[PDB]
Amino acid sequence: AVKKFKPYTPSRRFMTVADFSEITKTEPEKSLVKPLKKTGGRNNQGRITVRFRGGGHKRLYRIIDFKRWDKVGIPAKVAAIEYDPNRSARIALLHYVDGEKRYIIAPDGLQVGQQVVAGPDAPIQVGNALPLRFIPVGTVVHAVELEPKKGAKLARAAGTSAQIQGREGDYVILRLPSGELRKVHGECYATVGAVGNADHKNIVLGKAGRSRWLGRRPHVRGAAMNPVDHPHGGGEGRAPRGRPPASPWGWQTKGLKTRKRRKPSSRFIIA
Amino acid sequence: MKRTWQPNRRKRAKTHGFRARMRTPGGRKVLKRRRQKGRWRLTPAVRK
RNA sequence: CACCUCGAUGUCGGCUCGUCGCAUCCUGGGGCUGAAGAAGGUCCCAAGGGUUGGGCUGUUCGCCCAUUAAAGCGGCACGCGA
RNA sequence: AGAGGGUGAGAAUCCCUCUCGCCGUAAGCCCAAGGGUUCCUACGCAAUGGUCGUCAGCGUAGGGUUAGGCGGGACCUAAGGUGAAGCCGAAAGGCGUAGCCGAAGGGCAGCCGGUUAAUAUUCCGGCCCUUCCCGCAGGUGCGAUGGGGGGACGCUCUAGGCUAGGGGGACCGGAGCCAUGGACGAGCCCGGCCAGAAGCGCAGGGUGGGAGGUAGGCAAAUCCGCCUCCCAACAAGCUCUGCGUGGUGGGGAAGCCCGCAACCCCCCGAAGCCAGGGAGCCAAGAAAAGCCUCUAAGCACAACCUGCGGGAACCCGUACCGCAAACCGACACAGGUGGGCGGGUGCAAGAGCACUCAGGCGCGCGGGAGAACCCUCGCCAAGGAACUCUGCAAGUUGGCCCCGUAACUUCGGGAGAAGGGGUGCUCCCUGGGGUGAUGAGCCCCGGGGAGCCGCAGUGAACAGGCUCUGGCGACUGUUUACCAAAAACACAGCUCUCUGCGAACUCGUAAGAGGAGGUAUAGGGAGCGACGCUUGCCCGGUGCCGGAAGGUCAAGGGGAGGGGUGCAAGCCCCGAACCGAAGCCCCGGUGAACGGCGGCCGUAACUAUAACGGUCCUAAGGUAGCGAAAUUCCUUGUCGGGUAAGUUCCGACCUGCACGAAAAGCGUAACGACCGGAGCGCUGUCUCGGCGAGGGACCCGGUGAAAUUGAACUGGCCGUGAAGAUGCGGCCUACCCGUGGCAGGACGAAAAGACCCCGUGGAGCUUUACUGCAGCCUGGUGUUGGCUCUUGGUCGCGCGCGGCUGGGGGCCUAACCCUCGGAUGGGGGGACAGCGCUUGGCGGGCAGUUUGACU
RNA sequence: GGAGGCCCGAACCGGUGGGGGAUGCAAACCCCUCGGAUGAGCUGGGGCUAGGAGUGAAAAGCUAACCGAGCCCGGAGAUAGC
RNA sequence: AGCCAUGGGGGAAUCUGGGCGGACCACCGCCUAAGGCUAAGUACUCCGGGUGACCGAUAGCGCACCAGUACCGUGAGGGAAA
RNA sequence: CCGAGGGUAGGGCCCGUGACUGGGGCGAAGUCGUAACAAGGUAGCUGUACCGGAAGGUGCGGCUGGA
RNA sequence: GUGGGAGAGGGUGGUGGAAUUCCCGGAGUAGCGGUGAAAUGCGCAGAUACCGGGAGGAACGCCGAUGGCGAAGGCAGCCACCUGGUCCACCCGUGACGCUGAGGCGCGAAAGCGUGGGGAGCAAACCGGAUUAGAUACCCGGGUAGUCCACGCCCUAAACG
């Protein structure tokens, strides 16, 4: 959905917040299977290497299951849908018949108290994981492995999905949410359905904090610095680059392709 | 106003400490020097 | 023009304090007047004193308002920032 | 501040007393940090002390700091640090799992009192615990570093009980007091508690109990988790805290000759306790040990467990300062410094404000004058902004309650709009709330009448001036520490763009990392910068994107042909075709990529204009909307409004010097210590100044700087002189020396001018300056391997079989690379990528430099 | 009911205007006045990042009281056609 | 542009070998790489001594002296005087 | 006490009027084009949108009052 | 009320073929395209034409009508569900309970708007090519919103019988 607020304060007058509708009457997160301490840290060993990070509410890291085959043919009951603070997706914490609990990231449609299960013998239904091989062509799927046994790595953002576009024998062709067309291996476990909480895109932060709460520190326009700082910058009394739009480091930032060419990914991608 | 000396024994030992000196081959040479200069104190004195 | 001052002579305007010049704006004396009178004009003699309050502008200046005997002009490091 | 008394050679300054003032969320008390003896005491006063000094934080000396329970450590983990294993680097060394270290975080046993000159939760006293070791009755499957639970968590709001604390009391206890007109009183003054095991109570936290199945928590579990059912269920119980009580132990004032032993009642009452309490919300909120449980190996003659006894219980800190004279500021420096307590009355509240407890101070120079002037402060006739860049400043306003409030609007707002009225005290009647108990005192909100006094009742302190109107910016935010707080940055939001995940990108030589334990609803880069309505045209140039042709194109391949030397085969060199990348050329796309978005003629059945036409140039000629503008030179354009008067302002006109569409265009409610304009209010801003207060200034005693300084015996005017003379000339004037004043001069001081120029000076910065480098691109080649498909050029020879090689298509796996419940392996990639050498290219990201002279 | 980069206002953080200070109490102070004051808040403690490097809600700000390239030592007696 | 060395690529032989004598070739000659050790003659002076047309307390070492101290600096580091 | 009214403040409506501005009306014989009425020489009209010296064009759907 | 009927009436979900466009392969060559004629454009960087494969979106050809349904706007593949209206019959029930309808409420083509998604074809704007005195047009080649979806607005019409 999304909650708008009345404008009893500026920013509040624009700031939509998430519709917590399908958050299983839960709140706190199942410890054990999740969570770890999550090491916040905006730089690396020494130095900032991603600007405008920092601060922002503390998070426990819900440790999710991105390979589902540990639990082949072991059905689990969807214990609950819970909010996971380190993702746009919402985690589904399932109780496995096996006893073991894990959180999967929660596809649209999923419901508390539902059987999901992994494996090639898996019904083609919401939430069940299956190596791509065994998924009906043209089905929407998410949480896709890229290479097999290496973990889900694709579509897992929220209302992200991928279509199986057909097969190349030992492979399979996904329409990644990018719109990219890629050959992915059959053996790669995707999980049926779309990532859900597809409403995420539509939230309006509002106030300039909030962004802050997200650990997203104020970004500053290269042009607005000085030549020491940036390609843009200086020459001042406002100014138009002086061509052509660039990054702090020099490389062009309007349309300059960046994937490297000889990258073995290929004969694997198409558009 | 908040001036530049904000004495903290831990910080002081942690930083100009003798062990501190001996970890960095820089520090080692520092010690080396003060010794050869016959400094009475090789390291900022702090005690607790 | 580049002569003192670049091991510094603070630069506009204002305020404050003046003080000098007179090529006089008033006021005092005069001549001519195309001066009847009262007004003017113009020139001569003469700073003694005087030479307003505002609007606008950083302004100086100036334009305005209201007056006035008049609302003088300059110099003083475009006087005056130990 | 005053005085009195001590002390002393010497006292404004030390001691004592009385009086006075100041603080009282302190300027009092506790704790941390830092400081490191500054603490106590006895002797001292050279120096330190801004004076004094008998005093001291000073000198000499002596003494003082006592812990199982407080804080740290023989506990735990956090970031981080370190670091076996492992990775990487010319060397230094960089990483890095575990582990280890790391605390103000988690864990853990002490409370009240008394004692010292100085220590005290340490010593003493009383009561009450903790852990380790040994031992005995009686009881259990005992046993980890492993397994599990627990620990274990946010923010806002908040309940119920308590407690701390506080307020009364007619009650309990008291030395006493009756002044100065009155009061012998249900008078005044002081005080009416603390701690306390077990048991109790009261409040609250934690907690289903079974039974069986178990493919999970790395086949160890009866533990946990997951299934299932007779019960039980808005509970009881069971533990665990807190608070009462509690055997008992302490304390115990105001007060005099100089020392008599209560302790209760009511109320208010936390932000503290119960505590893992409750609710709501999104931004989703540490770990680990202790603890409990589980089972392993081992072992059950153990071992735990439960008691009860008896033993054992280390190291370190502990004075003192601690918002400051003991810490950071060279100083006994008006600055800076975290946590806790912080009483009472009154003002709506409060940690505000005034006064005041406890407590602590009067700030380590004084005494006098009573000028100018300055500072801070008070008042002011009439005027009321005339001040002035400007209402700068100051004033007015001011709390609360009631009434009442516009445009406009995003609808929340604009609102504290505006603008009024009320405000004390007395007496009378009356409604509800809390606590009691349903009567009652007790606090707590009120309403309704009459009535008193004053100039005045938020009677003192705290306490908005208001309005209209533009500009910029949406907004709260951020900023130039030490001249800028802004219209700058940020900002939600918009667009473009890169990036498929070993992502791009960033840092690093690398390893490694960030990105992200993220995955296109995401991440990077850029610009724009709420929101509204919009964002036109032009891809000639530049950029970027696309383009299996072509052109150019390096190494390399290729060798026609030519050469050097040999008696020689030979050995050497060059060396044409020709095949040979990326890059550039080339083609095309591309504007929220860099950017650009014209000129001259002529034309109205009046004239003035040009909708129309014509023509030149362009890559295309500026659309909408603005528009003498944060832009308009001319300019104070011109009209209009405002004013008595308006270079400003506001509204208009557009010949826009030189707006214009995401270096966004035009608007926009709200917001603004932003910048304009206007008005009311009010004023010492002013006309226009006067008086008055206090700190200085002045005078005396004490202490006593400073920059500056060629030496000075340092006048005015005319001149003169390097062109601005105390210093030359002439003349004038002028006894010698101070003090308070004032600033014209000493081209006064200060800083070897910031401007300016100069120097084959320097740096930051830019780029289509040069030249490099990183980086990326790229051919060849090494690592580098296997089986086929397919087409070439070369000499034979006969377009077909044979040489020799290569190119492209696939495929594979086994190098390399990535991954997978641990691997002599599997899965994915795959001879590609990576990496080495080498080729060319792009290359302000970076670096070194150049960027003439005359004038 | 009790939301909010909501309002007023202490603490606390600030630093707007003015005056004072200007060999200061002070190498940034004082007074009056103003901003924020549940938040992009403030703060103690423990940590990490540094010299063409960091950090930077961006001022070339800050990086130990002067930062368009910190400080120290060294090259070093740089060079100085001044 | 040899020689020596060697990151890359290709890649020998064992004296009918093989390097060298300044591209190269031919003579002529030198020498035997791809393993290692090897005193002495050389350098320096913390340290002991000797000597000086060396200083003589602003000199001489920074220090004649209780100096790498006092003091300054967070620190590296600076650094007296007497 | 109430009270004429006076005063101060703030609103509501109405009239006049205002630089400049928008269109509108009328104007014997103005300029530019020709949109419409005949298939009006691109059927017309239309609501809407966008655009253009202007009529108007074009898109979209619609009516026939068109073929 | 019982029983039946016709129907592009409405909503949701799902599904099928044709065709356009683009993409990959095969083959193949000197033009294709377009018009009144053209030119722009496209094409030896290998287009058009043909074959195969693939992606996607929109509209649903024949049936189709001079037809059907809805109150209107309007509704057309097929399927399923959900649902409105409406007609016939039998004469059963109720027993006037009716008609209209200011206001209100609802619906309301196209275009337009907001937020997301979508985008092949078409196509305002705009871009060129012609034509023309010009040609901001008609014609030609491109081509953005839009056209589609979801939700929310807008509420107009030759909303016409």
Ligand SMILES: CC[C@H]1OC(=O)[C@H](C)C(=O)[C@H](C)[C@@H](O[C@@H]2O[C@H](C)C[C@H](N(C)C)[C@H]2O)[C@](C)(OC)C[C@@H](C)C(=O)[C@H](C)[C@H]2N(CCCCn3cnc(-c4cccnc4)c3)C(=O)O[C@]12C
């Ligand atoms: C006296 C206080 C300052 O006053 C002035 O600043 C004065 C107004 C001047 O500026 C003075 C007139 C200048 O001289 C003029 O220079 C011109 C270039 C030419 C003139 N001609 C005479 C040549 C010459 O006189 C100059 C350069 O002073 C800059 C003189 C030169 C000696 C100085 O700069 C001078 C040292 C100034 N300075 C630091 C600079 C101030 C930074 N600061 C500011 N505020 C604080 C501050 C405030 C509060 C607390 N702490 C610090 C610090 C000082 O500490 O002293 C100053 C004089």
Ligand SMILES: [K+]
């Ligand atoms: K000068």
Ligand SMILES: [Mg+2]
């Ligand atoms: Mg590390």
Ligand SMILES: [Mg+2]
């Ligand atoms: Mg490090």
Ligand SMILES: [Mg+2]
């Ligand atoms: Mg992409």
Ligand SMILES: [Mg+2]
């Ligand atoms: Mg920014």
Ligand SMILES: [Mg+2]
């Ligand atoms: Mg800037």
Ligand SMILES: [Mg+2]
């Ligand atoms: Mg920098």
Ligand SMILES: [Mg+2]
């Ligand atoms: Mg650039």
Ligand SMILES: [Mg+2]
């Ligand atoms: Mg640059």
Ligand SMILES: [Mg+2]
């Ligand atoms: Mg500019």
Ligand SMILES: [Mg+2]
């Ligand atoms: Mg620029």
Ligand SMILES: [Mg+2]
């Ligand atoms: Mg210091």
Ligand SMILES: [Mg+2]
């Ligand atoms: Mg510490």
Ligand SMILES: [Mg+2]
């Ligand atoms: Mg520290």
Ligand SMILES: [Mg+2]
């Ligand atoms: Mg000269």
